Structure formats: structure tokens, C-alpha cells
Amino acid sequence: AACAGRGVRVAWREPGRCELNCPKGQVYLQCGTPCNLTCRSLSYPDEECNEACLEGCFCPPGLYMDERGDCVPKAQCPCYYDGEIFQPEDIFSDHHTMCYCEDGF
């Protein structure tokens, strides 16, 4: 981590020492981007994110990650609105507004 802080990345993990056994189908990456991993990123796309890459467990390139840690296509992400979690294709209408959840937004 100190090396990475100085911008040097070392592939030091190996089967004989300290492999990250990632949950479920997530894939270990030595340099992955955190900005667009979770489906909340879909629900809040205008929240700016410029964070550098980091090692960890990430979903495959075509899938986002939900609350359960399961990798899902963006069509299956829930939508977060006013702090409430709505399922895909959910619709609601209020005195003031009409909304519907699609593709995590």
C-alpha cells in the first residue's frame, strides 16, 4: 500500500501467500476503478468521482454490484430515491411527482 501510494504497484500476492478469495463471482483486480462498481453509482450518476484505482474484488466489466454483493446487469439494479430502495420497473406517482425505476436510475 505504501508502494501504491508512491505510484508503484507490485503483484505480490500469490497462491502461497495472501490471495484475496473474492465473494461469489467477483474477480480480483490489482488496479480497478471504484467509481462505477455499485448500483448507487447508477442511481446517482451526477455525483462526481475521480478516485484512483485500487486492488480489491470487482464485478466483471459488464455487471454492477448490488447490496447483496451479487453482480447484476444494470437492468437489474434497484433504484435509490430519497433513501428508499426501489426494484426494477417500479412505478410510483405522488401529488407532486411521477417516477419509475429503469436501469438503476
Binding site: 430502495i85 412505478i91 410510483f92 406517482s93
Partner: protein, 105 residues
């Protein structure tokens, strides 16, 4: 005024006839006028703060059921069970017989 339960209803589809409960709100004056909110998706907030579950706080006890439904208990005389999709079951001990008011009678 031991408790006070309020439901927020929204149109839940395109049809005018499709109206279902989005969120539930519970005042507990005897618990220093706490305000619990049971949200869509079975999240819980207390005094506006999203709380991690289970919550034990005096008489109040909020926890996930095996069905993933939030079960709220307060004392032994009041209980609630919120599935997050729109189903709410409120159970009162006989202690509240005749004392109750609202849509539930």
C-alpha cells in the same frame, strides 16, 4: 398517546386504482419522542438517521425477519411487521382494546 402509526400512500402503477403504501412512520412519545420511519425496500430510519439492524433501544427492538421483513417491537404490547413492498401488519396486545383510533378502527 403511547404510539402513533402513519402510512404514506402513493399511486403504485399507471392505473388510478393502483395505490399502495410506500413508507410507514411511527411516533413513540414515551421513547423521548422518537420518530421511526420504515422505508420502501425494508430500510429503517430513526430521527432521520438510517440505522443498522438489529436495533435495541430501550423498549424498542427492530430486526429483520427470516422473510427479510423488518419486525418492530415496542414493549410487549405493540408489534409491527413491514415487508418493504407495501404490506404492513400491526399487532396490538389487548391492553390497547378500545383505546385505538385511525383507519384501523
Amino acid at each position: 398517546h403511547s404510539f402513533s402509526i402513519v402510512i404514506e400512500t402513493v399511486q403504485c402503477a399507471d392505473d388510478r386504482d393502483a395505490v399502495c403504501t410506500r413508507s410507514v412512520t411511527v411516533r413513540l412519545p414515551g421513547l423521548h419522542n422518537s420518530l421511526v420511519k420504515l422505508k420502501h425496500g425494508a430500510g429503517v430510519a430513526m430521527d432521520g438517521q438510517d440505522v443498522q439492524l438489529p436495533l435495541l433501544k430501550g423498549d424498542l427492538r427492530i430486526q429483520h425477519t427470516v422473510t427479510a421483513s423488518v419486525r418492530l417491537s415496542y414493549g410487549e404490547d405493540l408489534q409491527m411487521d413491514w415487508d418493504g413492498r407495501g404490506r404492513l401488519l400491526v399487532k396490538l396486545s389487548p391492553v390497547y382494546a378500545g383505546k385505538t383510533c385511525g383507519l384501523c378502527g
